[PDB]
Design a protein around this ligand. Structure first.
Ligand code: IBR
Ligand code: CA
Length: 240
């Protein structure tokens, strides 16, 4: 997260750290959302490589023991059938992971609330992006969970030539574009928490930013619109 603020230890209990075995250690790669006690939702592109993955729940500080962490391995990876590595602008940037075991729910570990199917937020809706991604373009990963206020940009605007143009689709969500705040590398797969009817819900999955940089004016952070995959999500969990 670029231009964000350190998040409170118990503000976003649904946030997870997706890591992969690196030699003799683990390294944060993506964010994700705990949707089930044994299911996590992330970005497809996060699990494109064939590495060993593990999920860290109740995580706050990557390089420090918070006394709240729960480490679980990934048992099964279910990417979206229409997903294609070479075409991120195509969509379908979503994957469901089945955890080896069920995590213990508590103050730091909670299930993310999903939006109802077909739900579209109005322009300039109140949202927050969370993650441990790069704090600066081409910078380094954040040690502690960061957060940034990211109002949404409606399809009509986001799809305009001055913005993302045709690169973006109706099955995506735009947020930010102020040239100051945004998602960055390592934040993707993570949640986009939006306040609807007094309650925060996960309306998107961090997908992509511009090749130019993370924080670029008129280049909002792009997310996979979760409300577009409700049916799919339910079908996967019920069958696996
Ligand atoms: C976000 O999920 C993410 C995280 C990492 N570490 C690498 C890539 C991605 C998504 C993406 O499309 O960015 C390409 C890397 Br310039
Ligand atoms: Ca920790």
């Amino acid at each position: 997260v670029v231009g964000g603020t350190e998040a409170q230890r118990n503000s976003w209990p649904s946030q997870i750290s997706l890591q992969y075995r690196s030699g003799s250690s683990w390294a944060h790669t993506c964010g994700g959302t705990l949707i089930r006690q044994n299911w996590v939702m992330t970005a497809a592109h996060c699990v494109d490589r064939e590495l060993t993955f593990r999920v860290v729940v109740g995580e706050h500080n990557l390089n420090q023991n918070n006394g709240t962490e729960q480490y679980v391995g990934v048992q099964k990876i279910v990417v979206h059938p229409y997903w294609n590595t070479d075409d991120v602008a195509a969509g379908y940037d979503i994957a469901l992971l089945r955890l080896a075991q069920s995590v213990t729910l508590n103050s730091y570990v909670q299930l993310g609330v999903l939006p109802r199917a077909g739900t579209i937020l109005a322009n300039n809706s109140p949202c927050y992006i969370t993650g441990w991604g790069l704090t600066r373009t081409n910078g380094q990963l954040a040690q502690t969970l960061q957060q940034a206020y990211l109002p949404t940009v409606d399809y009509a605007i986001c799809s305009s030539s001055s913005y993302w143009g045709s690169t973006v689709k109706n099955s995506m969500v735009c947020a930010g574009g102020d040239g100051v705040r945004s998602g960055c590398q390592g934040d993707s797969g993570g949640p986009l928490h939006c306040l609807v009817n007094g309650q925060y819900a996960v309306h998107g999955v961090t997908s992509f930013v511009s090749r130019l940089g993370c924080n670029v004016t008129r280049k909002p952070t792009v997310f996979t619109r979760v409300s577009a995959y409700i049916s799919w999500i339910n079908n996967v969990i019920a069958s696996n």
